[PDB]
């Protein structure tokens, strides 16, 4: 955790690991100070093929500061205006009425608060 | 190599900050007349790049081919 791969304290995502002893390296043990989160550095000790090896994939999600690109199968519907409806806009869920707006958005913004 | 990206007077203002392996770049432009000194005024900077490169950055050098000013956040 300190010298090879540090996860941030505010992490939002998932960790997946599995065992590949049927398929079947180097790590770092000496360094000046701990790593900052999500940093890499390329004093190396090799693994011995102490227990069976594991493979790890870590998924980190970027939470909609840009236009949305990666998301699952849901079918879009026609929008209903001036009527009390339940709405789901890009995973943002609410209950209300929807009207045309005179506010102007700069291109990097997607919603207003 | 790990990361590659190719995309297709004056006063150019930039803000560079590095955190959680992300390099944030902010850019703004303002037209002025004098070159010798920084003029006083207010100008806001919009986001341009968030680069996912996880290295420590402790030094930098400007690349040249007529003045530049550096301040610290």
């Amino acid at each position: 955790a300190d010298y090879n791969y540090k996860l941030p304290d505010d992490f939002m995502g998932c960790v997946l690991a599995w065992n590949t002893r049927n398929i079947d390296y180097k790590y770092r043990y000496l360094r000046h100070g701990k790593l900052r989160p999500f940093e890499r550095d390329i004093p190396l000790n090799d693994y011995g093929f102490g227990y069976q090896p594991y493979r790890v994939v870590v998924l980190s999600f970027e939470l909609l500061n840009a236009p949305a690109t990666v998301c699952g199968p849901k079918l879009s519907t026609d929008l209903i205006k001036n009527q009390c409806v339940n709405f789901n806009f890009n995973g943002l869920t609410g209950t209300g009425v929807l009207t045309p707006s005179s506010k102007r958005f700069q291109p990097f913004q997607q919603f207003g608060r | 190599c790990t990361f590659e990206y190719i995309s297709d007077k004056h006063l150019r203002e930039f803000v560079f900050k590095n955190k959680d392996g992300f390099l944030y770049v902010y850019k703004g432009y303002q037209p002025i007349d004098v070159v010798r000194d920084l003029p006083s005024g207010f100008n806001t900077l919009k986001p341009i790049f968030k680069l996912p490169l996880g290295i420590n950055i402790t030094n930098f050098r400007a690349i040249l081919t007529a003045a530049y000013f550096v301040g610290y956040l």
């Binding site: 207003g112 | 203002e13 207010f42 986001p47």
Partner: peptide, 30 residues
Amino acid sequence: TQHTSSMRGVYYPDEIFRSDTLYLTQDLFL
């Protein structure tokens, strides 16, 4: 040489629309 940076270097903190308000934020600013 050395100069002063008066009221200079402000950027947008987040990608959220706001209007007609006063907003206090804590961040790395010049």
